[PDB]
Design a protein around this nucleic acid. Sequence first.
RNA 1: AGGAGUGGAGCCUGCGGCUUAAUUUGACUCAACACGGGAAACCUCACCCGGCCCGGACACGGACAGGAUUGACAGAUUGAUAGCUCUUUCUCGAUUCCGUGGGUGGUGGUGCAUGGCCGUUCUUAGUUGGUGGAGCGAUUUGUCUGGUUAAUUCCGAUAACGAACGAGACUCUGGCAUGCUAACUAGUUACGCGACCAACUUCUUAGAGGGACAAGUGGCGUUCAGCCACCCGAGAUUGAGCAAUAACAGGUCUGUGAUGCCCUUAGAUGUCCGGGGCUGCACGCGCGCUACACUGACUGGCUCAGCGUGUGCCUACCCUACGCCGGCAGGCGCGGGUAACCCGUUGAACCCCAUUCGUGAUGGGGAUCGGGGAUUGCAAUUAUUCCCCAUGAACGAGGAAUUCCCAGUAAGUGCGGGUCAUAAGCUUGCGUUGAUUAAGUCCCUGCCCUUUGUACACACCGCCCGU
Lengths: 97, 225
Amino acid sequence: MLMPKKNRIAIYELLFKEGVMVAKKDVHMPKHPELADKNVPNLHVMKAMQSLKSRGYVKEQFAWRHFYWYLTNEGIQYLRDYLHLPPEIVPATLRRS
Amino acid sequence: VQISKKRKFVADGIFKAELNEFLTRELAEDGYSGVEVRVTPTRTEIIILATRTQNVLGEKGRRIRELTAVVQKRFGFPEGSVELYAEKVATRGLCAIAQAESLRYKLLGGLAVRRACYGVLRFIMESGAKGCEVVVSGKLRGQRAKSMKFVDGLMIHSGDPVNYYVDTAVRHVLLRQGVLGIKVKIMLPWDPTGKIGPKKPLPDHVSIVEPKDEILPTTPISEQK
RNA sequence: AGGAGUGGAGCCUGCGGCUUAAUUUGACUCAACACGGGAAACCUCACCCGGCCCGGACACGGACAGGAUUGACAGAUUGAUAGCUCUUUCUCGAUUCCGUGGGUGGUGGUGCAUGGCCGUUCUUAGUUGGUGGAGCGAUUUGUCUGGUUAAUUCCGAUAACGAACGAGACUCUGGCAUGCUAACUAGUUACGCGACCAACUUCUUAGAGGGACAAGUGGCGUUCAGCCACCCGAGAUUGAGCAAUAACAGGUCUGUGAUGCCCUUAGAUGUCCGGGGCUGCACGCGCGCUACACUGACUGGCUCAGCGUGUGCCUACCCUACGCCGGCAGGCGCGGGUAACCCGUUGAACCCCAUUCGUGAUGGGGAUCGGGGAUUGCAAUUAUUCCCCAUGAACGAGGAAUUCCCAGUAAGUGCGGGUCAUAAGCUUGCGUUGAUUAAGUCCCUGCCCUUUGUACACACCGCCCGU
């Protein structure tokens, strides 16, 4: 919450570009171990991630102070319906198969 | 860049513990038994033991590539540095973790606990185990929780031999009523070689080599044709 | 008829009794009370004189280029360079807000819904099938008359026979090698100097081994199990760890998207060197801080101990080797050590001693409390931070009640880890000095292996009688 729309689209191209990620719950602290130096404020990026994975339509699992994600196709369908980005631009994650 | 040997050993132990918990909480349904991290010059190869391997690799090795990638991006290894395999376990019937998961997934669907516990106990015994005991504690309807225990065979509790003759698994089963915890203890048989059981025998067990039947005449007489 | 050290003589904490911002959650004998590894300014304070940035996958309502966000010293605030001043119409700019809860949850309830961990009954030796005997049966035998053992340990006996746990064995730890495996961080031999005036490894380190078995002897023991004593021996019941089903409405939901929902509030048990207490003294209690004489401490006049710790995923925080010099930690330059390499053969320490007690208030061990430069922690006082002037305190075995303890016990004494900013009066370990009494008993408190009684079974905190 308390999240601007430019940071929204920023976190959304981050989700588009990465897909499969790992993370840790950090909010107040000003430097980050593995998801810092992204030219965007840490707090708004992490709160937008909170919105992404806790809005109520993609499930999570919280343990050992870290996050591992299964990004369902319902979320992909929501993204395609909202931003109108077709899946024909496949993620580059399908290499080294 | 460098830390002392005490810190290094402790960090290696923490890495092993967190990796084990991670691939315990991920694929407990896949028959996962345990992890074993092997050192290799400038490498860290990982072996996963599971009763079901087609399901940990999946189609086209999807699950393996995903969880290898997340372990890579998590544990600070350089790009493309972690490679884990998935091999079957030669002792499926007398591994405590595997049998605990088997009970938890026999109970998660909603079933009578006595039938499942007796089936698991019978299967462990028919796997050559020296003895077992299964404890299931939790809610069985009512204002009170009960603990019912199923034993068969012989089992030790005290001393050092319990460290290498008994393997224990404690698991939580989440039902809509609440949580029931299961406890599977298996007393491994004594077997030299094969890694099925401990190499040393029970320290209170003394062995004697057995002679054979000797019914012989009074004096040996050579016989020639 | 033993004692030693006690809670009363030298380093404040826990929770209730107990004025308003002060006696603040969980834990009601052992089995609560430096216990939640909980050393409270504050992030963890809910007893707290005070607030703001506030929440809804939905059930229904108020409707769009404005419906406000921590964010100004000097007129102030109720401590506070917090715009909260009934104040500017500065400032990310559609972020959001109000009424009820499921929610991305609440260190929010319920541990009388649970899991898992512990603690305890219960430190003792206890416990249970199968088959076979007995009984209509609950149930009993096995699991025992005796002797023996620390032991349901064994001998033995025997309607029981075969077994399974627990006990033992086991693991770790100490104690011992004219032995073994080898070290440029301990340790060294006559073609060695800086001195007639590259030892096939042993003190330290640590390994495949050895060594102790009531083994030898003597005496007690259906001459069995075993017990006592004595040589020899490094050592002759030798530290701990682990530890049986049934147990308890024992503690923990405040360790854990470990976990089942009845359910408050906007003053979320979020932040921000910010901020009252609890650091009072008629004590309401509990754990703690302390040695009585030529023994206590100084001459600084000989090589002393550890057990251990020590510097980037996080991260901004490590242990320490000379001089400014009053008399040394030390405000600043300086190197070493990710460590048997440096601290350090452990850098403001023995218990000793030509500062001394001639018979005990003196020199002998400190009632406060003042200065010398303070390690540098905003604050410390509403917990951090040295020895000296000898200023004289019942100045030499202690209401009722009692807690711990049998040899390297106790006690004295310092040191290191945890907590941490080198924060300890706490705890967890470690050495150092060093031990009076006892090798017994069932009297008190309890426990166990039997027989017996019972009107008890919520099991004596029971049950129960009487106008």
